[PDB]
């Protein structure tokens, strides 16, 4: 149907919105901590810990799948790469202050991005 296909063009444009997005949330994590999943080779007991890893290799799969049905989905996905590591490291570590840097910078940029979803109609 023709509104099927307009959902999905909605949907493209999203995914373009978003990636520009996530391109600019994953520049404010200059020393790439955030870049892959945390290896069970190396961190044996990480699910113990954390139920659902995520990272920025994850998120760009499921937005090149369209897997993002609105901004919310994406934020939650963000989210869960701050989260996660504010509960596994320490507040001494580089990883957790990284985290936190990148939580305060991102902001300004999901702010913004928020308000782009809206204006355009994107969801």
Do not use: K, R
């Given at each position: 149907s023709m509104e099927q296909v307009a959902m999905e063009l909605r949907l493209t444009e999203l995914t373009r919105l978003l990636r520009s997005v996530l391109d600019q949330l994953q520049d404010k994590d200059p020393a790439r901590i955030?870049?892959?999943?945390?290896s069970l080779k190396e961190v044996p007991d990480y699910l113990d810990h954390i139920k659902h890893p995520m990272d920025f290799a994850t998120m760009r799969k499921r937005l090149e799948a369209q897997g993002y049905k609105n901004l919310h989905e994406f934020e939650e996905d963000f989210d869960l790469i701050i989260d996660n590591c504010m509960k596994y490291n320490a507040r001494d570590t580089v990883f957790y202050r990284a985290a936190v840097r990148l939580r305060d910078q991102g902001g300004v940029v999901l702010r913004q991005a928020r308000r782009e979803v809206d204006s355009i109609g994107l969801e």
């Open positions: 955030f870049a892959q999943p945390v």
